[PDB]
Amino acid sequence: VKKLINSQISLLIGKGLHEFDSLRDPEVNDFRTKMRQFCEEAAAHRQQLGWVEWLQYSFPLQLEPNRALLVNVKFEGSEESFTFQVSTKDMPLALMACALRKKATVFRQQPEEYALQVNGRHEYLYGNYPLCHFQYICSCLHSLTPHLTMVHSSSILAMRDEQSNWSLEQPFSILIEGRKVNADMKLVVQAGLFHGNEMLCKTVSSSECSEPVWEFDISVCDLPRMARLCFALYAVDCPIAWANLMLFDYKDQLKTGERCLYMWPSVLNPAGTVRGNPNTESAAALVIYLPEVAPVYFPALEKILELLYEHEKDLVWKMRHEVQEHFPEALARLLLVTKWNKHEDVAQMLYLLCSWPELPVLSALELLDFSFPDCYVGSFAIKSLRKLTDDELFQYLLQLVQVLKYESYLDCELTKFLLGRALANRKIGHFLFWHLRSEMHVPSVALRFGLIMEAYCRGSTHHMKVLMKQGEALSKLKALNDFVKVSSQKTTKPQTKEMMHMCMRQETYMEALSHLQSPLDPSTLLEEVCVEQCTFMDSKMKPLWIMYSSEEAGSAGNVGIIFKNGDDLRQDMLTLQMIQLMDVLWKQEGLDLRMTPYGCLPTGDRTGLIEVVLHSDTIANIQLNAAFNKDALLNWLKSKNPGEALDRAIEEFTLSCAGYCVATYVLGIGDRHSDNIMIRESGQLFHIDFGHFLGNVPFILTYDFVHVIQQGKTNNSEKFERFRGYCERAYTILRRHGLLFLHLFALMRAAGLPELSCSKDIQYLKDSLALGKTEEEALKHFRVKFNEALRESW
Length: 794
Ligand SMILES: CCC(=O)N1CC[C@H](Nc2ncnc3c2CN(c2cnc(OC)c(C(F)(F)F)c2)CC3)C1
What we know:
This protein is α+β, with helices and mostly antiparallel strands. 44% of the residues lie in helices and 14% in strands.
């Protein structure tokens, strides 16, 4: 029985569980047994949760950051529906008391034993929030009458049931023979002792073949708990390989004897993995002699607690106790000023960190960076992050996963936190899965991520099968995309499109591609695949256009996905999460710049999905075709928004244009052309290919857009300066939360994105957001760039 659950886990995570045993690793084996028990205890809690408490797990609420509304409601397993007049300020129990009052009237034959399901979707409307606050009821108002289904307590409960399962003064010292080296020239081995991005002593090098055979300025007593010994083999300068090791193991014991380090290819790297290269055969190895001291374990918290300019740093350390009292948020500045190469100074800091008050989510997000590698500093950060909302945790989930790459040991406070929250929310567990599964091709992350997904599956027997279905569809889509890629080069598009449909109509494909949850959004059910409306896009990697159509949801079941294999979808995903954050921060301060942060999620090696924005078209397609090319875009909105509807559309356009003009400027999105800018029939303007960001520069205002803002008029200052305001207001909101973007962008350095690697890339975001300058000084600097963008258009 357990052999099947294990076979499914191996297929789902794309790594056999037998591979973990073959390592015969006490660290990997201890993680597996400990985390399985943690997840099983979490899974146990869910099978006893109340019916409203389960709805909270499986279908978390989607909420936005007086007036009337017509809504059709219908009880489960009944054709008969009822349209009722409800207020936007009315709570779901009022709709449920109206639906129950109508039911008793018609059927001749308590609303608190019910929940409203967004018909044909895995989204629910529960809790004491007015109908205006729900993402669905709110979106319908701007779109469409909301279609709801009265799901009873017994129907929600039948789901959970079905979803069941030590101080030596001697100077520190290390080098035997290093096998499998490819070079011309002499080989040297440089070695530095790091505690994050900072050094603990001088970088001692080795003496200047394919199999070459061959003292640190810090004491063995002074070595911090999280000390790294970083190596680099090079030719004497052409780099060859690098390797990192923790001087203390997971059981907190000082490393002794021989160690064979399987090095990673280059062209000292502190941020790199402390674990070796998996290609034992290919990788160049460096055998080192980690010296004897005796066993020596690191002092426990009980025994440990018992113990800016150059001159400015000395002042921060003197007033360290005053920093805990007067400036607790200044913890980061104090930790940096602490000397981690002095056990006496590093112990005094822990005595202050242990009595230190909890920090806000923003201050905790900085402490998660590689500049802060201490376990107690790390545990403090996660302890402060425990106050995160499930919706807030989701907004930063991508960045927290990247920080798992900075982790020194497999069992860590972050893995526990991320897994604990994942098992508490099916939406957080869904996305954590795909953030981990999409990096299984990467050899460095492959073990950590594999073991985390296995543990989640140990505590999600049903969700494992849900994700397996998603994973089965994505396999058929790679196989189908490969056909489209081969065939496209041989025949006419209608011939390839017809060939794709025949392939899709196969039993194997129809079964796989249908009745699954969207990997981009678990609440969107990709039901019946519309083979006739499916095709492929003309871009280099021939992306797939896969249309779906649910009957139970009507128009809401008509959804589409884009499968793209060949290119990196990470930066596009990062940019869209940053635009969604912008839209949230804007809405929080009453500014809805009607944004379209469409779904984009990487699922594999150069493989991922993109949500289809229905009823949209590229600016290039509209402009290709009006007596004047400038009038094409306005005449287009006139076609889709006739009569009194045009006025709403020009406003929708302006708002979205302002938001995207700021977003593309701030994020530094270059390569802007008519083909990677889209418009929705509602008037909403959005951007699509985010291949390049952070100036890889100035504010850009297009004349074809400035014309739509001006209501088609040559001179229209009322409407154009109203737009200038939206840009100013939106840019100043982001500036206040600039520290939030800088912290998340700092954590994303772990992703290994070519366009986000150095400190110069983060400087672009400091400059665009004019971080140093005062609000007045920064609003003027933007007013110069904006006015210059206006002159730049003819
Ligand atoms: C089969 C109809 C057709 O060829 N179209 C072309 C223009 C238009 N494109 C879209 N229409 C509606 N929604 C979207 C799109 C295009 N989107 C999209 C966004 N990033 C991407 O890559 C990073 C890609 C892709 F190149 F990989 F495919 C597509 C966003 C969603 C429809």
